[PDB]
Tab-separated table of C-alpha atoms (C1' of nucleotides) and ligand atoms in Angstrom:
chain	number	residue	atom	x	y	z
A	151	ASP	CA	-6.408	21.586	2.681
A	152	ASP	CA	-6.830	19.259	-0.298
A	153	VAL	CA	-6.008	15.590	0.283
A	154	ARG	CA	-5.560	14.883	-3.442
A	155	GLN	CA	-2.495	17.151	-3.412
A	156	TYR	CA	-0.695	15.247	-0.644
A	157	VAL	CA	-1.010	11.648	-1.878
A	158	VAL	CA	2.324	9.820	-1.696
A	159	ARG	CA	3.096	8.634	-5.228
A	160	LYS	CA	5.335	5.707	-6.149
A	161	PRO	CA	7.945	5.995	-8.914
A	162	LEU	CA	8.077	2.964	-11.180
A	163	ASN	CA	10.805	2.417	-13.790
A	164	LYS	CA	11.458	-0.970	-15.394
A	165	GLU	CA	14.152	-1.472	-18.016
A	166	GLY	CA	12.721	-1.325	-21.522
A	167	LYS	CA	9.616	0.588	-20.391
A	168	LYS	CA	8.984	4.300	-20.006
A	169	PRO	CA	9.094	5.775	-16.483
A	170	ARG	CA	5.772	5.944	-14.658
A	171	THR	CA	4.291	7.116	-11.362
A	172	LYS	CA	1.394	5.385	-9.604
A	173	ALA	CA	-0.853	6.635	-6.807
A	174	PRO	CA	-3.475	4.699	-4.821
A	175	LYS	CA	-7.198	5.350	-4.906
A	176	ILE	CA	-8.251	7.515	-1.965
A	177	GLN	CA	-10.715	5.845	0.399
A	178	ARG	CA	-13.281	7.521	2.668
A	179	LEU	CA	-13.085	10.596	0.435
A	180	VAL	CA	-16.079	12.921	0.220
A	181	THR	CA	-17.114	13.103	-3.443
A	182	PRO	CA	-20.246	14.345	-5.234
A	183	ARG	CA	-21.331	10.713	-5.670
A	184	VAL	CA	-21.357	10.149	-1.897
A	185	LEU	CA	-23.385	13.321	-1.353
A	186	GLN	CA	-25.846	12.309	-4.080
A	187	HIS	CA	-26.278	8.849	-2.545
A	188	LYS	CA	-27.006	10.426	0.845
A	189	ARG	CA	-29.382	12.892	-0.827
A	190	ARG	CA	-31.394	10.071	-2.406
A	191	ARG	CA	-31.462	8.134	0.867
A	192	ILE	CA	-32.995	11.248	2.426
A	193	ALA	CA	-35.387	11.751	-0.500
A	194	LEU	CA	-36.868	8.251	-0.187
A	195	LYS	CA	-38.084	9.023	3.345
A	196	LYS	CA	-40.154	11.912	1.977
A	197	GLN	CA	-41.807	9.582	-0.538
A	198	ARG	CA	-42.598	7.029	2.168
A	199	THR	CA	-44.092	9.706	4.434
A	200	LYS	CA	-46.218	11.199	1.649
B	1	U	C1'	-56.716	-73.161	-23.203
B	2	A	C1'	-61.156	-73.803	-16.277
B	3	C	C1'	-56.105	-79.906	-19.490
B	4	C	C1'	-53.178	-84.013	-17.394
B	5	U	C1'	-49.663	-88.806	-18.034
B	6	G	C1'	-46.114	-93.332	-16.112
B	7	G	C1'	-45.202	-96.275	-11.440
B	8	U	C1'	-47.821	-100.914	-5.839
B	9	U	C1'	-51.567	-106.254	-8.514
B	10	G	C1'	-51.880	-112.911	-11.406
B	11	A	C1'	-55.690	-109.336	-12.983
B	12	U	C1'	-59.408	-105.065	-10.890
B	13	C	C1'	-61.341	-100.496	-8.401
B	14	C	C1'	-59.240	-96.941	-4.850
B	15	U	C1'	-56.352	-93.888	-1.262
B	16	G	C1'	-51.778	-91.832	-1.774
B	17	C	C1'	-47.318	-90.035	-2.883
B	18	C	C1'	-42.913	-90.251	-6.331
B	19	A	C1'	-41.746	-89.044	-11.371
B	20	G	C1'	-43.166	-86.703	-15.738
B	21	U	C1'	-45.183	-81.062	-18.072
B	22	A	C1'	-45.050	-75.411	-18.852
B	23	G	C1'	-43.455	-70.489	-17.058
B	24	C	C1'	-39.905	-67.276	-14.205
B	25	A	C1'	-34.681	-65.909	-12.313
B	26	U	C1'	-29.304	-67.087	-10.690
B	27	A	C1'	-25.255	-69.994	-12.154
B	28	U	C1'	-22.924	-73.136	-15.717
B	29	G	C1'	-21.930	-76.214	-20.535
B	30	C	C1'	-21.859	-76.463	-25.924
B	31	U	C1'	-22.717	-73.095	-30.128
B	32	U	C1'	-23.164	-68.284	-32.458
B	33	G	C1'	-23.805	-64.599	-39.103
B	34	U	C1'	-26.864	-59.138	-39.368
B	35	C	C1'	-29.534	-55.066	-36.666
B	36	U	C1'	-32.605	-52.206	-32.236
B	37	C	C1'	-33.096	-51.818	-26.976
B	38	A	C1'	-30.738	-53.205	-22.613
B	39	A	C1'	-29.383	-55.606	-16.680
B	40	A	C1'	-24.564	-55.815	-14.726
B	41	G	C1'	-19.578	-57.215	-7.117
B	42	A	C1'	-27.092	-57.241	-4.106
B	43	U	C1'	-26.781	-62.672	-2.069
B	44	U	C1'	-20.555	-64.982	0.662
B	45	A	C1'	-17.203	-59.981	3.294
B	46	A	C1'	-21.782	-52.589	6.055
B	47	G	C1'	-14.540	-57.335	4.415
B	48	C	C1'	-9.570	-54.420	3.308
B	49	C	C1'	-7.687	-50.736	-0.117
B	50	A	C1'	-2.082	-48.653	-4.022
B	51	U	C1'	-3.003	-44.631	-7.480
B	52	G	C1'	-5.683	-40.676	-10.052
B	53	C	C1'	-10.210	-37.862	-10.300
B	54	A	C1'	-15.284	-36.784	-7.833
B	55	U	C1'	-16.755	-28.857	-4.900
B	56	G	C1'	-15.918	-24.775	-6.074
B	57	U	C1'	-17.106	-19.761	-7.158
B	58	C	C1'	-16.642	-12.029	-9.898
B	59	U	C1'	-20.409	-8.494	-11.974
B	60	A	C1'	-20.953	-1.681	-14.277
B	61	A	C1'	-22.087	-2.412	-9.080
B	62	G	C1'	-17.411	-4.873	-1.284
B	63	U	C1'	-11.333	-4.317	-1.075
B	64	A	C1'	-5.692	-3.285	-6.479
B	65	C	C1'	-0.115	1.825	-5.186
B	66	G	C1'	1.884	-6.786	-8.014
B	67	C	C1'	4.484	-2.303	-14.462
B	68	A	C1'	2.278	-8.833	-14.468
B	69	C	C1'	0.643	-6.188	-18.893
B	70	G	C1'	-1.027	-1.544	-20.636
B	71	G	C1'	-3.298	4.702	-23.429
B	72	C	C1'	-2.727	9.879	-22.486
B	73	C	C1'	-1.479	14.009	-18.984
B	74	G	C1'	2.908	14.467	-16.551
B	75	G	C1'	1.925	16.552	-8.578
B	76	U	C1'	-2.571	17.570	-11.629
B	77	A	C1'	-6.439	10.626	-5.937
B	78	C	C1'	-8.292	6.416	-8.914
B	79	A	C1'	-7.569	5.353	-17.482
B	80	G	C1'	-8.312	-0.067	-18.585
B	81	U	C1'	-7.039	-6.084	-18.357
B	82	G	C1'	-5.917	-8.210	-14.034
C	1	MG	MG1	-15.160	3.687	-0.154
C	2	MG	MG1	-46.537	-106.793	-11.384
C	3	MG	MG1	-42.634	-82.804	-9.429
C	4	MG	MG1	-25.222	-54.140	-43.294
C	5	MG	MG1	-19.937	-56.242	-1.083
C	6	MG	MG1	-23.059	-56.075	-0.066
C	7	MG	MG1	-24.585	-52.474	-6.826
C	8	MG	MG1	-18.366	-37.752	-6.767
RNA sequence: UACCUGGUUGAUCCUGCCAGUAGCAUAUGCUUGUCUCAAAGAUUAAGCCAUGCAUGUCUAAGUACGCACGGCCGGUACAGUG
């Protein structure tokens, strides 16, 4: 299942402003950036060993 | 600038101090037109204090669902300032 689908959003409607919906930033979410950081951490060990 | 002068005797030569002389640094008195520097509650009380200020800090890079502001899609995690 996808977590990004099930985020609880907050409606937000102030007088004189258009209606809006806000959702929080997901934390501890596996993203390509996390995998690439781990990949480079692994790749530095190879350089040290060589 | 390696310097002296008055005072003891009726007069003299001494010893010897007192007083005189010139800096310096604290106070005080009188006086004071222009410019450049410039010390300044140490001495008596490391005595006592009204009031105000004298220590705070964010980058692309720890944590933003404050519309507090803000552009588009509109479930389509999180635009940005903060
Ligand atoms: Mg995280
Ligand atoms: Mg005489
Ligand atoms: Mg003298
Ligand atoms: Mg003039
Ligand atoms: Mg004092
Ligand atoms: Mg004192
Ligand atoms: Mg002082
Ligand atoms: Mg101070």
